[PDB]
């Protein structure tokens, strides 16, 4: 069965019996100053092409929606804000395609730099709506301000197989093709500046590479849909 979900002036369709992973057992809620409900809509980013040699993709959350409608408008307008997210990841593949994906949302995914003495620049840390790709090779140290994008360390100097500690969902093409992660607001402060701090990082890493026989489509599109939940910002009026 197919379930159609409409948010604002946007609507998407999902398999009725799809499993949703709630981040830490906590749904997005309001801070127990000024909320916005016109932002409550689905933002379908550009689809990426999962290939045989694909190493992975990642998107920093606040930044990914920085050039999308009122949410971006609110980001430049207000100085402070806080919000949760609902992330939909969908793959369009046939039964003749095989592969396994890890879809994980990492809070405060601070990333290292190829040069041990420096830190990565903003452009390399995030591409906004554009996706950032991991690399199956090791970035050379000569490089001065790029992210060490070796997949098996996930750019954080940890075991990539241990990323399951963070809220995650597996996409096994033979079994399922969609993932839904509900991420609450997680921070050490009640509100924060959205332009200088990326609270969340969504990662999609192929643990089992995509495989197919000659004649089948040589790619599998992956579509990411993000809907901000319970967004609210600081007031701008007097007392």
């Amino acid at each position: 069965r197919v379930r159609s979900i409409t948010l604002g002036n946007s609507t998407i369709t999902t398999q009725e019996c799809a499993n949703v992973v709630v981040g830490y057992g906590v749904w997005p809620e309001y801070l127990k100053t000024q909320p916005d409900v016109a932002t409550c809509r689905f933002y379908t980013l550009e689809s990426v092409q999962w290939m045989k040699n694909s190493a992975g993709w990642w998107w920093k959350l606040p930044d990914a929606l920085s050039q999308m409608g009122l949410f971006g408008q609110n980001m430049q307008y207000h100085y402070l804000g806080r919000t949760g997210y609902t992330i939909h990841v969908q793959c369009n593949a046939s039964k003749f395609h095989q592969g396994c994906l890890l879809v994980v949302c990492v809070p405060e995914a601070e990333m290292g730099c190829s040069n041990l003495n420096n830190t990565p620049e903003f452009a390399e840390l995030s591409g906004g709506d554009t996706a950032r790709m991991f690399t199956d090779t090791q970035i050379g140290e000569t490089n001065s301000k790029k992210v060490q994008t070796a997949v098996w360390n996930a750019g954080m100097g940890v075991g990539v197989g241990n990323l399951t500690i963070y809220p995650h969902q597996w996409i096994n093409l033979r079994t399922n093709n969609s993932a839904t992660i509900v991420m609450p607001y997680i921070n050490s402060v009640p509100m924060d500046n959205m332009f200088r701090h990326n609270n969340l990082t969504l990662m999609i890493i192929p643990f089992v590479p995509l495989n197919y026989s000659e004649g089948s489509s040589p790619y599998v599109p992956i579509t990411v849909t993000i809907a901000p939940m319970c967004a609210e910002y600081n007031g701008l009026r007097l007392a």
Partner: protein
């Protein structure tokens, strides 16, 4: 008996984090340490299993002295008294043994004389934020600093004036988180730590290797 794997029993252990020396005839004979949890790799890794932490600080100081060479015919130095000053974040900081900062009333200080039990002081959670952050994906611009984690600085100096011979003292700072609360588990650090200030790493293998998948 899963009691020993709780957060409190996992992190509430005293550890020597810093070690320094200072003599009493140099004008610069004072030891300083900015309080940070990244000094010791073992403690850093244990704290970096989580993203946000909230704890109190218990500090114990082990101070010992040693007689330095002199030419005096006879040396009969009295018992030595040491001053340990805690400078809260934003407080004045000394640059010499004789400096006003040593007398700031808002900089709590402990005066301790040798031969007694080692001095001990406790600092509470002093962040304007609601928790300390071991990881920060953003800018303050410097990436991943989060100045909301400032915990203050410690300073140590001889109180006694120099006698007929120099005295060199060494201080061992013992660090113990108390009433710890942790949030958002994270994967254990796998690559070796390279810098104390950042998370930079050099790519390493996922695990140790065997000959074949069937051993």
């Amino acid at each position: 008996s899963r009691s020993e794997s709780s957060i409190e029993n996992f992190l509430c252990r005293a550890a020597c984090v810093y070690y320094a020396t200072y003599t009493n005839n140099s004008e610069k004979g004072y030891a300083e340490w900015v309080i940070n949890t990244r000094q010791v790799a073992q403690l850093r890794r244990k704290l970096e299993l989580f993203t946000y932490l909230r704890f109190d600080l218990e500090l114990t100081f082990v101070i010992t002295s040693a007689q330095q060479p002199s030419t005096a015919t006879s040396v009969d130095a009295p018992v030595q008294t040491h001053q340990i000053m805690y400078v809260p974040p934003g407080g004045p900081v000394p640059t010499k043994v004789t400096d006003y900062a040593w007398q700031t009333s808002t900089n709590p200080s402990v005066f301790w004389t040798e031969g007694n039990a080692p001095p001990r002081m406790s600092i509470p959670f002093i962040s304007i934020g609601n928790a300390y952050s071991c990881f920060y994906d953003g800018w303050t611009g410097v990436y991943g600093i989060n100045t909301l984690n400032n915990m203050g600085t410690l300073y140590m100096r001889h109180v006694n004036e120099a006698g007929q011979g120099p005295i060199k003292s060494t201080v061992r700072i013992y660090f113990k988180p108390k009433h710890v609360k942790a949030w958002v588990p994270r994967p254990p650090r796998l690559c070796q730590y390279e810098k104390q200030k950042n998370v930079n790493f050099t790519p390493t293998g996922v695990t140790t290797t065997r000959v074949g998948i069937t051993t």
